Design a protein around this ligand. Sequence first.
Ligand code: MN
Ligand code: MN
Length: 327
Amino acid sequence: ETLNGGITDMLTELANFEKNVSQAIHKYNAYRKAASVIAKYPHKIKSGAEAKKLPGVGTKIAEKIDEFLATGKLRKLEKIRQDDTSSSINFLTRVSGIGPSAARKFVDEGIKTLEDLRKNEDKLNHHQRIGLKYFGDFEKRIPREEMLQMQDIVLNEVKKVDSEYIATVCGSFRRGAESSGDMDVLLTHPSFTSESTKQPKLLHQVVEQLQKVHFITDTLSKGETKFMGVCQLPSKNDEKEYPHRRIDIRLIPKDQYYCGVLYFTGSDIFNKNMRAHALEKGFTINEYTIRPLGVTGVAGEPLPVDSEKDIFDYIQWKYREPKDRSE
DNA sequence: CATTAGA
DNA sequence: TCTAATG
Ligand SMILES: [Mn+2]
Ligand SMILES: [Mn+2]
């Protein structure tokens, strides 16, 4: 957690680089498993060979550890850290819609900067076009104060269109959190569930409503169950306008909401931890259901959930307020 | 780990 | 269709 900090940190720097700049999935995958185990190691790794003893650690990585242990730096790390090309990929990538793939391609063509990005807006698809348009705002964190306003609006329309609609703003926001990165609204309705063959409109309707009133500004991607967009709070009695916010709305068949919801609320740890328990407690939990574990090894049969309660109950846990889903 | 765009 | 990208 800190005894091996630098070693894992470097390892990650390296890993990340292969995966992006180069196309070294293997090497890349190599660095992480490596970084993964040394992290778990209970003792200050004093040397190559020492780490070396570990699974995942080969000759190449050890060697790196040696140099870094020896001197407070890594050359190869130093070389990349400097290099404009790799530098450029790291950058372009920030644009919503630009993955490494395209990052590299652009680079190749010579699009390195944000300006260059503009002068060739044509080279970019809508998503990436929007990404660029909202580049500053896309980087800015969302104040709960703002999150509170947002959520207010959504909930209002949703209901206006259909009273039968169930919506949940999940994530960090849900979990109390001071700021959040983008809004995630979980959505479900009674006339939609596991079997009931769709009702795309179910998604569509609201998407519209939101737009209609100007909450939704742009569309990043929209399908019959998941829409990805951009939103914004009505700029008051002028002198101050609101940054553009990433927002994602998803349709869920009523019969999987809470698992769904439960889930998204996290925290990643809480999840796992919750999930680990369900296992002893004779169950299985995953993004949509929870099924009783059969002794033969495995077993199926989705239990019936009406609230985040039912689930706790199931694995007979303490119902944990989202506030404290922290771990 | 899955859903949407794209070309 | 595959491949990319966000989550
Ligand atoms: Mn979020
Ligand atoms: Mn999101």
